[PDB]
Amino acid sequence: FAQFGDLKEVRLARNKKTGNSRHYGFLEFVNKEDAMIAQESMNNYLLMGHLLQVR
Amino acid sequence: APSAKATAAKKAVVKTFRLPKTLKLARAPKYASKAVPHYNRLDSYKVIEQPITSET
Protein backbone atom coordinates (compact mmCIF):
# COMPACT_ATOMS: atom_id res chain seq x y z
CA PHE A 1 0.00 0.00 0.00
CA ALA A 2 2.99 2.35 0.35
CA GLN A 3 3.21 2.42 -3.46
CA PHE A 4 0.05 4.54 -3.64
CA GLY A 5 1.41 6.95 -1.03
CA ASP A 6 2.51 7.45 2.54
CA LEU A 7 0.89 5.08 5.05
CA LYS A 8 0.23 6.38 8.56
CA GLU A 9 -0.59 3.22 10.53
CA VAL A 10 -1.15 -0.45 9.69
CA ARG A 11 -2.39 -3.18 12.03
CA LEU A 12 -3.41 -6.81 11.61
CA ALA A 13 -5.90 -8.85 13.64
CA ARG A 14 -4.00 -11.84 15.05
CA ASN A 15 -5.22 -14.58 17.37
CA LYS A 16 -4.42 -14.10 21.04
CA LYS A 17 -3.18 -17.69 21.50
CA THR A 18 -1.56 -18.50 18.13
CA GLY A 19 0.60 -16.13 16.13
CA ASN A 20 -1.18 -16.72 12.82
CA SER A 21 -3.30 -13.88 11.48
CA ARG A 22 -7.09 -13.82 11.10
CA HIS A 23 -6.81 -12.90 7.38
CA TYR A 24 -8.21 -9.41 8.00
CA GLY A 25 -6.92 -6.08 9.22
CA PHE A 26 -7.04 -2.31 8.93
CA LEU A 27 -4.74 0.49 7.80
CA GLU A 28 -4.87 4.27 7.54
CA PHE A 29 -3.46 6.69 4.97
CA VAL A 30 -2.33 10.27 5.50
CA ASN A 31 -4.83 11.41 2.84
CA LYS A 32 -8.47 10.44 2.37
CA GLU A 33 -8.17 10.76 -1.42
CA ASP A 34 -5.31 8.25 -1.51
CA ALA A 35 -7.23 5.85 0.74
CA MET A 36 -10.34 5.95 -1.45
CA ILE A 37 -8.23 5.57 -4.60
CA ALA A 38 -6.56 2.50 -3.11
CA GLN A 39 -9.94 1.06 -2.09
CA GLU A 40 -11.33 1.60 -5.60
CA SER A 41 -8.27 0.06 -7.25
CA MET A 42 -8.38 -2.94 -4.87
CA ASN A 43 -12.15 -3.17 -4.36
CA ASN A 44 -12.31 -6.58 -6.09
CA TYR A 45 -8.67 -7.23 -6.97
CA LEU A 46 -8.19 -10.98 -7.38
CA LEU A 47 -5.43 -12.51 -5.27
CA MET A 48 -4.02 -16.00 -4.79
CA GLY A 49 -6.48 -18.27 -3.00
CA HIS A 50 -9.25 -15.68 -2.78
CA LEU A 51 -10.23 -12.23 -4.01
CA LEU A 52 -9.15 -9.39 -1.73
CA GLN A 53 -11.89 -7.33 -0.07
CA VAL A 54 -11.40 -3.71 0.99
CA ARG A 55 -13.92 -1.13 2.21
CA ALA B 1 -4.23 17.18 -4.01
CA PRO B 2 -4.61 13.81 -5.77
CA SER B 3 -1.22 12.51 -4.54
CA ALA B 4 0.16 11.89 -8.03
CA LYS B 5 2.03 8.89 -6.63
CA ALA B 6 -1.38 7.32 -5.99
CA THR B 7 -2.35 8.20 -9.57
CA ALA B 8 0.75 6.40 -10.88
CA ALA B 9 -0.04 3.39 -8.69
CA LYS B 10 -3.62 3.33 -10.02
CA LYS B 11 -2.35 3.54 -13.60
CA ALA B 12 0.04 0.65 -12.96
CA VAL B 13 -2.74 -1.43 -11.39
CA VAL B 14 -5.08 -0.76 -14.32
CA LYS B 15 -2.28 -1.26 -16.87
CA THR B 16 7.05 9.28 -49.22
CA PHE B 17 5.77 5.71 -48.98
CA ARG B 18 6.50 3.42 -51.92
CA LEU B 19 6.13 -0.25 -52.82
CA PRO B 20 8.75 -1.96 -50.60
CA LYS B 21 11.32 -4.06 -52.45
CA THR B 22 9.90 -7.36 -51.24
CA LEU B 23 11.70 -10.62 -51.97
CA LYS B 24 10.82 -12.05 -55.39
CA LEU B 25 11.33 -15.73 -56.18
CA ALA B 26 12.85 -16.71 -59.51
CA ARG B 27 11.01 -19.09 -61.82
CA ALA B 28 11.41 -22.76 -60.86
CA PRO B 29 8.74 -24.70 -62.77
CA LYS B 30 8.22 -28.32 -61.80
CA TYR B 31 8.49 -29.23 -65.50
CA ALA B 32 9.77 -27.69 -68.72
CA SER B 33 7.12 -26.70 -71.25
CA LYS B 34 9.33 -27.92 -74.14
CA ALA B 35 11.86 -30.04 -72.22
CA VAL B 36 13.02 -31.67 -75.47
CA PRO B 37 15.35 -28.93 -76.78
CA HIS B 38 14.88 -27.80 -80.36
CA TYR B 39 17.68 -28.27 -82.87
CA ASN B 40 19.44 -25.33 -84.50
CA ARG B 41 16.84 -23.47 -86.54
CA LEU B 42 19.49 -22.03 -88.90
CA ASP B 43 22.63 -24.17 -89.00
CA SER B 44 25.71 -23.45 -91.10
CA TYR B 45 24.50 -25.65 -93.96
CA LYS B 46 21.08 -23.96 -94.03
CA VAL B 47 22.77 -20.53 -94.11
CA ILE B 48 23.98 -21.22 -97.67
CA GLU B 49 21.09 -22.42 -99.84
CA GLN B 50 22.52 -22.82 -103.35
CA PRO B 51 25.53 -21.57 -105.33
CA ILE B 52 25.13 -18.83 -107.93
CA THR B 53 26.73 -19.67 -111.29
CA SER B 54 25.78 -16.52 -113.22
CA GLU B 55 28.46 -15.45 -115.69
CA THR B 56 28.48 -12.01 -114.06
From Swiss-Prot, chain A:
Origin: domain of life: Eukaryota
Keywords: Cytoplasm, Nucleus, Ribonucleoprotein, Ribosome biogenesis, RNA-binding, rRNA processing
Record flagged with keyword Cytoplasm: yes
rRNA processing found in the keyword field: yes
Knockout consequences: Essential gene. Abrupt growth arrest prior to substantial depletion of ribosomal subunits. Fails to synthesize the 25S and 5.8S rRNA components of the 60S ribosomal subunit, and exonucleolytic 5' processing of 5.8S rRNA is strongly inhibited. Arrests at cytokinesis and fails to assemble a contractile actin ring at the bud neck.
Molecular function per GO: ribosomal large subunit binding; RNA binding; rRNA binding
Cellular component, GO annotation: cytoplasm; nucleolus; nucleus; preribosome, large subunit precursor
Compartment(s): Cytoplasm; Nucleus, Nucleolus
GO BP annotations, alphabetical order: maturation of LSU-rRNA from tricistronic rRNA transcript (SSU-rRNA, 5.8S rRNA, LSU-rRNA); ribosomal large subunit biogenesis; rRNA processing
Boundaries of every RRM domain copy: 1-55
UniProt subunit comment: Component of the pre-66S ribosomal particle. Interacts with NOP7 and RRP1.
Function, as annotated: Involved in the biogenesis of the 60S ribosomal subunit. Required for pre-rRNA processing and cytokinesis. Associates with the precursors of the 25S and 5.8S rRNAs.
Miscellaneous remark of the record: Present with 4280 molecules/cell in log phase SD medium.
Name this protein carries in UniProt: Ribosome biogenesis protein 15
Lineage, broadest ranks: Eukaryota, Fungi, Dikarya, Ascomycota, Saccharomycotina
Gene symbol of the encoding locus: NOP15
Residues of the full protein shown: 111 to 165 of 220
Swiss-Prot record, chain B:
Coiled-coil stretches noted in the UniProt entry, renumbered to this chain: none
Compartments, record wording: Cytoplasm
Cross-link (Glycyl lysine isopeptide (Lys-Gly) (interchain with G-Cter in SUMO)): 46
Domain of life: Eukaryota
Similarity-based family: Belongs to the universal ribosomal protein uL23 family.
Known function: Component of the ribosome, a large ribonucleoprotein complex responsible for the synthesis of proteins in the cell. The small ribosomal subunit (SSU) binds messenger RNAs (mRNAs) and translates the encoded message by selecting cognate aminoacyl-transfer RNA (tRNA) molecules. The large subunit (LSU) contains the ribosomal catalytic site termed the peptidyl transferase center (PTC), which catalyzes the formation of peptide bonds, thereby polymerizing the amino acids delivered by tRNAs into a polypeptide chain.
Subunit structure: Component of the large ribosomal subunit (LSU). Mature yeast ribosomes consist of a small (40S) and a large (60S) subunit. The 40S small subunit contains 1 molecule of ribosomal RNA (18S rRNA) and 33 different proteins (encoded by 57 genes). The large 60S subunit contains 3 rRNA molecules (25S, 5.8S and 5S rRNA) and 46 different proteins (encoded by 81 genes). uL23 is associated with the polypeptide exit tunnel.
Name of the protein: Large ribosomal subunit protein uL23
Organism, as annotated: Saccharomyces cerevisiae (strain ATCC 204508 / S288c) (Baker's yeast)
Lineage: Eukaryota, Fungi, Dikarya, Ascomycota, Saccharomycotina
Gene from which this protein is expressed: RPL25
